[PDB]
Design a protein around this ligand. Structure first.
Ligand SMILES: Nc1ncnc2c1ncn2[C@@H]1O[C@H](COP(=O)(O)OP(=O)(O)NP(=O)(O)O)[C@@H](O)[C@H]1O
Ligand SMILES: Nc1ncnc2c1ncn2[C@@H]1O[C@H](COP(=O)(O)OP(=O)(O)NP(=O)(O)O)[C@@H](O)[C@H]1O
Ligand SMILES: Nc1ncnc2c1ncn2[C@@H]1O[C@H](COP(=O)(O)OP(=O)(O)NP(=O)(O)O)[C@@H](O)[C@H]1O
Ligand SMILES: Nc1ncnc2c1ncn2[C@@H]1O[C@H](COP(=O)(O)OP(=O)(O)NP(=O)(O)O)[C@@H](O)[C@H]1O
Ligand SMILES: [Mg+2]
Ligand SMILES: [Mg+2]
Ligand SMILES: [Mg+2]
Ligand SMILES: [Mg+2]
Lengths: 278, 281, 279, 284
């Protein structure tokens, strides 16, 4: 260990691409000084409608958040018109890959992951989120696809900071309507608690509730309906027999429209459901 | 139609009508027009704002003219200030009347009677319907912004720049399936339906003298309104028998406007047709 | 400011001495680029008989641990023969200051801190220790003197990393090895902090660690030779422990187990009945 | 009268007695002394040590002479090895004997009898007393380090350099402010340890002569650690299934072992006191 991570681009040999969007590439790289194969997220600032002045607070937050249930951020530096984020390489895939695999094998009759694997994975997610919240931070993009698995059996939340920020859009009132009030006050960590309840639905049913709808209809479907439950998007109600009352109550505590009514991650760690974590 | 002057020297400043942090309303004589106007002088610096950020507001102001909307004449910058030149309505506002009644101690069985609320608010709905048809939002509907002409006219003030500053001013690729509702609400905008809520609160204020959460600090008003069911006519009132005279149609009207879900609120055209507004003189 | 702390000595203007010792000097400093008054711990590497090479891992650890219950570490750099540690400046003194004030005034006739005050402060300590333990870290120097209060009401453990490390002294198949030899072979782990935490609760209740009356070399032997201490060990008279009930005493006996495997983790202690007394 | 040579040209290397990663023990003829010796060749690179770290060990070795300690003659570096020149005990070790009895199948109901354990361990205790009263610790007491003379002598091997290396070097070397908040296991480390560590090892060696093996020989090195620190101190029967494999071991032998096997070093007797034990009256 000893020293700080190199901000010299030439200290990193680019290797196999892991994933490739528009326009961010997650590529494996070897860092000789550290003798470690790492993952580099390469974000073209131009293409994301962003800049280094916009992203500074986000990078400062990533430099400060260090916990075993958060993918280690090592360092970041600009390479020409790209921001590079150097992080720990997790070789176990995401929880979403495991979901896609169970579904593709047709093993999802009666449910996708059983109640005790969900308790186990999401307990680790709640420990990471509780740490971020205590630190005055918000993840913003909690989902199965951002829960990464280490070869050591560790569960780590990915994309805290710049990635999540870019994924979620970047950045007396006596007469003022509630929806104006809502945007005036902004939002807080309790937003993660809602996304956490959606993520529980996704691990049980394989998909988020309104997954069948285009992006702008999901916004409306969500706001013009009662909060979703396991039953909202599921293929068949038969898939919901692996799941009992304490899981459903856990989910429904998360999924309240009023953020103040949602429990904190620490209170959730205490829920009856999380006693099933083996 | 003949243009208003944009030269500061054409306007002789007179009585100060209202003075705050950020803004003064002052009477002025405009010699070229031979007309006594009101100027709202806004400190752009104190308001943490610029003419760049205000351009679209000013543009909307210069396009939006209706008998139920205070006449906007012109605007120009003087040193550190944006001056907004508008019609002078010295008869003042519905709030001035409210305060007179409260000051006399004549507010204990209600402030304004049903027929006078219906008359006033009908005119406000005509002004709002005009803005709304035209893709505009007011943002700051309240009694203090309903101005009264000597001739009986009812006109909504502060459209544009002032309602913008008064209320704060202040996507993304992918499917928002995990996004919290309060986050989605901020992402989507808001629209003219927000005025209908402010309208329902204004109805409460005309009858009782005040907004329902008037006794609370600014941040507690946000929490109480976001956390609780909408306020009723009687929330801000200790004598729960005060408004026993105010009937079913008024209360129904207010509860249509005071719905948390904006899609559920009526349009201003729809409210104009409400049974309550048949009470107007 | 979103930028990193400066590692140039000249961006810092050294002011009033906050605290001292034969070893290190803590000074208030203004950092001009950051417009903040910070605290700089200046450790004389010569007088501590250490080196930057012995300490780099400690600083690494400091640079990685960030939690609202651990004093914030900003930066560090070497000036001549001193290691300078730039930290958040806290203005509420320590829990030890409060203890010494209550003791000097003679207000400790039925105990120094109320049970709900001890529960509140120590709950915050246990959140910081649990965080550090989760990250594979050990504090090593848990004590009242290292629990700092912000004038905002926050509770923050001080001296994680270099200072605690310095304050604390920096085969085959072993079938024939004596247990005291095996103990040093194995080193120790985070359960050491849980013992110190248990002594720290005694200190908050009674005003001092249990064997405070004895010289430092006899403390080693006193501890090793006897059953673990309790509230009653270092006190005169049992009416001086009138504030403290059964669950407090049980919490403490759980920490003060000679076998570390038997001590609970900080996470487990947070779930203890005693801590339901926290305001 | 002639000093032991430090010239590698004075030595002829012969049969390899023992090999390993760390060291090779090799017979050798020393020419000016006209004697067949044993040389322990220690690879300093491989052992992650240096002549600087080892000098106080060598000094102790050149000081510590007793009939119950294998004779150290001299030492010198040849290239990357340190050569420890010592008396050749061709009779081999007590562990060679145990291994022979176990390979013959003759270890059921026990390995060495009581009187032969008594005879040997008394000689080890003499050598230990000599070491301890002189401020020395052996650190690697066990059957494999009890070497036998053609003449009946019993001598402890590996005093100094070898025992130091075998037990992990300066890891097991034996601040201002009061240590009031310090955990007992941290205090045990700051205090180091003393000659009483050898009395525990002697206790384990007794079990080994009787059963063939140390109590937790079946376990990986780190399980052994955990076990001995977590559990009660071992006894004669701890790793033995058919407990009738210990019928001819009496009460005074087991009591002797249990005096040795106390977690608290101060409770353990000195080698002097052990010499007076009723069990060592069974020695011939
Ligand atoms: N630190 C990491 N270690 C190992 N794999 C990673 C790491 N970070 C990302 N990945 C994977 O590499 C790809 C990352 O692409 P990315 O640009 O993050 O978009 P995405 O993961 O497909 N969608 P989203 O996570 O919602 O932003 C995905 O296949 C991830 O599962
Ligand atoms: N065109 C106008 N003619 C006459 N009086 C006016 C005019 N506009 C505003 N006023 C009065 O000037 C005073 C100050 O008004 P204004 O700057 O609107 O602040 P406010 O009404 O106290 N609060 P807000 O409307 O939310 O900024 C008020 O008493 C108004 O009644
Ligand atoms: N970040 C900080 N903010 C405010 N005060 C501090 C900070 N760090 C240390 N101090 C105080 O500065 C003084 C001297 O510091 P130090 O040399 O750490 O002495 P100490 O408190 O005895 N610590 P130790 O190393 O455990 O003996 C003490 O009175 C501390 O309480
Ligand atoms: N002076 C000696 N005379 C005769 N044989 C010896 C002498 N010293 C050691 N041996 C034997 O040489 C072999 C290897 O010796 P050595 O490596 O010291 O012992 P070990 O027990 O195999 N290893 P360790 O105990 O881990 O250092 C063993 O079989 C010893 O019995
Ligand atoms: Mg991912
Ligand atoms: Mg007005
Ligand atoms: Mg301190
Ligand atoms: Mg040997």
């Amino acid at each position: 260990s000893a020293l700080p991570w190199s901000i010299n681009r030439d200290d990193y040999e680019l290797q196999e691409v892991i994933g490739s969007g528009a326009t961010a590439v997650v590529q494996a790289a070897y860092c000789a000084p550290k003798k470690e194969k790492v993952a580099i997220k390469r974000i073209n600032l131009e293409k994301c409608q962003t800049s280094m002045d916009e992203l500074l607070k986000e990078i400062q937050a990533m430099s400060q958040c260090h916990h075993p249930n958060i993918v280690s951020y090592y360092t970041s530096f600009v390479v020409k018109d790209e921001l590079w984020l150097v992080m720990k390489l997790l070789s176990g895939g995401s929880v979403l890959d495991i979901i896609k695999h169970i579904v593709a094998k047709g093993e999802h009759k009666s449910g996708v992951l059983d109640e005790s694997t969900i308790a186990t994975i999401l307990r680790e997610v709640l420990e990471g989120l509780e740490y971020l919240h205590k630190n005055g931070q918000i993840h913003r993009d909690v989902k199965a696809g951002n829960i990464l698995l280490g070869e050591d059996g560790s569960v780590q939340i990915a994309d805290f900071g710049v990635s999540a920020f870019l994924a979620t859009g970047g950045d007396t009132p006596c007469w003022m309507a509630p929806e104006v009030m809502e945007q005036v006050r902004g939002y807080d960590f309790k937003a993660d608690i809602w996304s956490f309840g959606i993520t529980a639905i996704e691990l049980a049913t394989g998909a988020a509730p309104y997954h069948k709808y285009p992006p702008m209809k999901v916004l409306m479907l969500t706001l013009q309906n009662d909060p979703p439950s396991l039953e909202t998007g599921v293929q068949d109600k038969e898939m919901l027999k692996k799941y009992g009352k304490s899981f459903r109550k856990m989910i429904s505590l998360c999924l309240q429209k009023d953020p103040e009514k949602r429990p904190t991650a620490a209170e959730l760690l205490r829920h009856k459901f999380f006693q099933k974590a083996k």
